[PDB]
Amino acid sequence: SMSEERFRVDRKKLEAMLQAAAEGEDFFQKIMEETNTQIAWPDPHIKVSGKKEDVKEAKEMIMSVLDT
């Protein structure tokens, strides 16, 4: 099963995470490597692609940080 999920995240929380990932590997590339998923970003939305289970696991991690 191949899934592609698009969900809203806090704009200010996503703002701070992108800045920290610049000064740094990366919180997102760690999830992408760990879950074998593809993340895309522009509250705004981010987009995760991959296996149904991997997308579900990437979303649970991202949403815990970028909660709403």
UniProtKB/Swiss-Prot annotation:
Domain of life: Eukaryota
Compartment(s) of residence: Cytoplasm
Transmembrane segments: none
Involvement in disease: Renal dysplasia, cystic: An anomaly of the kidney characterized by numerous renal cysts and apparent disorder of differentiation of the renal parenchyma. Kidney of affected individuals lack the normal renal bean shape, and the collection drainage system. The cystic, dysplastic kidney contains undifferentiated mesenchyme, cartilaginous tissue, and immature collecting ducts.
Function: Putative RNA-binding protein. Acts as a negative regulator of Wnt signaling. May be involved in regulating gene expression during embryonic development.
Subunit structure: Interacts (via KH domains) with ANKS6 (via SAM domain) in an RNA-dependent manner. Interacts with ANKS3.
Family: Belongs to the BicC family.
This protein's name: Protein bicaudal C homolog 1
